[PDB]
Paper text:
Overall, nine variants (T256M, R296H, [name], S313F, V329M, S331L, E352K, A427T, and V499I) were considered likely to be benign. Assessment of spent media from cells expressing each of the 16 full-length [name] variants revealed WT-like secretion for T256M, R296H, [name], S313F, V329M, S331L, T353I, A445V, V449I and K500R. Structural integrity was further confirmed by high-resolution crystal structures, which were solved for 11 [name] variants. No gross changes from WT [name] were detected for the structures of T293K, R296H, [name], V329M, S331L, E352K, T353I, K398R, A445V, V449I or K500R, indicating that these mutations are accommodated within the native five-bladed β-propeller fold and do not perturb the dinuclear calcium-containing site. In addition to the five variants that we predicted initially to be benign (T293K, T353I, K398R, A445V and K500R), our study reveals seven more (T256M, R296H, [name], V329M, S331L, E352K and V499I) that are indistinguishable from WT [name] across multiple assays. Thus, our data indicate these should also be considered benign.
Numbering used by the authors: 244 to 502
Write the structure that this text describes.
């Protein structure tokens, strides 16, 4: 059941990092789970620092919320920032100090594909408003895998491209009029890109939308609360139909409603 985003619920805290290494990070589930994982499997990456390689994996939700990881993967190359996603058995992440997206198959711990995002800024050229080298933000929605970025040709406006999940080729590209560094983060629901106005405010909003199906841009005023005042990661999971976010040590989730 697709539709336009009309409401975001209150953030629910599922886990809190215990060290500064997890001030920012990304946590995620696979909306297209594949053996040996399930819809309960959760991954967590604490992303502070310069040689981020540890990916914590939890087989079931209770372990993610209360226990130790069931497995730790050591990535073969350091990861950049908070934009990564898991999709159909692979972690898609950006190589540190690069515009390269890497497909890392989790079960086999194998790199299956790598792609430079053509023309994408990286390492602080088109971050979201908080910085954090957030130039490249992967996304999964009801239609599959996407990447959110910008380029010099787009003058820093958000660009989004649909990606082939097997080989990382770009399938189609859209250019918005939204300055990427003017918004706190972004995510895609049902082919519409949404942005969040602030990473600090308890009274932020989902403030812009761009519908890739119609080409129409809109302003919105949907309330969005940063409970802990520093949201470094905001993504959408189309299986759960929820937002997943990382806010100042806290892994949080928001319910949503679509028209
Ligand atoms: Ca995002
Ligand atoms: Na992302």
């Amino acid at each position: 059941g697709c539709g336009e985003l009309v409401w975001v619920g209150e953030p629910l805290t599922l886990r809190t990092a215990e060290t500064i290494t997890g001030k920012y990070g990304v946590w995620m589930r696979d909306p297209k789970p594949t053996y040996p994982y399930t819809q309960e499997t959760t991954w967590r990456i604490d992303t502070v620092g310069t040689d981020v390689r540890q990916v914590f994996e939890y087989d079931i939700i209770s372990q993610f919320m209360q226990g130790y990881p069931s497995k730790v993967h050591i990535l073969p190359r350091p990861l950049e920032s908070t934009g990564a996603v898991v999709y159909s058995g692979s972690l898609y992440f950006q190589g540190a100090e690069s515009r390269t997206v890497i497909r890392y198959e989790l079960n086999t711990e194998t790199v299956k594909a790598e792609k430079e995002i053509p023309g994408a800024g990286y390492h602080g050229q088109f971050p979201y408003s908080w910085g954090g080298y957030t130039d490249i933000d992967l996304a999964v929605d009801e239609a599959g895998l996407w990447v959110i970025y910008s380029t010099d040709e787009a003058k820093g406006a958000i660009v989004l491209s649909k990606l082939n999940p097997e080989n990382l080729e770009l399938e189609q590209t859209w250019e918005t009029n939204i300055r990427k560094q003017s918004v706190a983060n972004a995510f895609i629901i049902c082919g519409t890109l949404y942005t969040v106005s602030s990473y600090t405010s308890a009274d932020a909003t989902v403030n812009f939308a761009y519908d890739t199906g119609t080409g129409i841009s809109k302003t919105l005023t949907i309330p969005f609360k940063n409970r802990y005042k520093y949201s470094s990661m905001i993504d959408y999971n189309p299986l759960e139909k929820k937002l997943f976010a990382w806010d100042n040590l806290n892994m949080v989730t928001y319910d949503i409603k679509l028209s």
